[PDB]
Amino acid sequence: HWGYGKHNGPEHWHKDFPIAKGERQSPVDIDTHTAKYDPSLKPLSVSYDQATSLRILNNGHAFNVEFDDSQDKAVLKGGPLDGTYRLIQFHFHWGSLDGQGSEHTVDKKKYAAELHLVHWNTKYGDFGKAVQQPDGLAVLGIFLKVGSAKPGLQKVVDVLDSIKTKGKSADFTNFDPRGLLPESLDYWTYPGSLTTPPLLECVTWIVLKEPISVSSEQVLKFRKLNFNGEGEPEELMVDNWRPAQPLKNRQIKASFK
Numbered sequence: 001h002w003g004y005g006k007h008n009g010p011e012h013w014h015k016d017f018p019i020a021k022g023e024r025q026s027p028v029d030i031d032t033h034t035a036k037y038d039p040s041l042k043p044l045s046v047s048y049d050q051a052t053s054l055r056i057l058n059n060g061h062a063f064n065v066e067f068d069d070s071q072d073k074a075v076l077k078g079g080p081l082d083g084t085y086r087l088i089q090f091h092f093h094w095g096s097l098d099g100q101g102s103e104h105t106v107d108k109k110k111y112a113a114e115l116h117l118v119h120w121n122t123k124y125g126d127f128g129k130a131v132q133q134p135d136g137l138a139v140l141g142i143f144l145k146v147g148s149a150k151p152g153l154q155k156v157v158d159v160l161d162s163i164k165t166k167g168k169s170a171d172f173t174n175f176d177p178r179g180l181l182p183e184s185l186d187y188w189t190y191p192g193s194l195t196t197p198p199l200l201e202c203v204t205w206i207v208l209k210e211p212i213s214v215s216s217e218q219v220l221k222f223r224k225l226n227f228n229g230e231g232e233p234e235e236l237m238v239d240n241w242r243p244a245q246p247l248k249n250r251q252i253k254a255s256f257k
């Protein structure tokens, strides 16, 4: 099965998922000087006030904080998007060291981690149908750098002990994802893909320019998770990121000058 090791990592994925070498793969390097300001891009609308978190799951690749997406309770609209996209889950990708971990890079700079808030286009009815569409998903990407703690992340950090291994889940209600956002919603946007198998080309990427700061202690707790299941040899869940893929025939647009 695919993963992030030497023998099943990103350079191997194309064998089971040929779209890995496709025309709109993610992540990518964001070359800030080549991105073009698009004055027609609208401000992002992040409406998370009625978000209902339910559960947190270690899926063997990352951990997902899952939301009730059976109504318009937490939605992303505006920006480059047409219509309404519902929040279904967020997760992170992170490194074994603070100098790596993000999937997108900015002028080749790697951040310590990257948060993905995953949303699906309500015109397609559910996530499974949405991922089959070129405009099916909108993923809001937020970089993490190590410095001051992010207070709104701490409730996530403190439950990780209870989902150490693959397949473990825990109740995770009343978590407010607004506490994970930076001050500014300035963003870059481009058409891309899921960054893990099945690597489907269904995502409008919206990557915020402003990173959030998390503490060394907070990211160290991410690195104590396991890729393996309980009772299997311990393999730390670190470096669960795909590297930058070729931009090919795409332009990255900026919402800001």
Ligand SMILES: NS(=O)(=O)c1ccc(Nc2nc(Cl)nc(NCCO)n2)cc1
Residues within 6 Å of the ligand: 088, 089, 116, 118, 127, 139, 193, 194, 195, 196, 197
């Ligand atoms: N890293 S990412 O591109 O944001 C991303 C987002 C979602 C998924 N996949 C996903 N996301 C959800 Cl909410 N459900 C399922 N069901 C399939 C489970 O195998 N798969 C993969 C990568």
Ligand SMILES: [Zn+2]
Residues within 6 Å of the ligand: 091, 092, 093, 116, 195
């Ligand atoms: Zn992701």
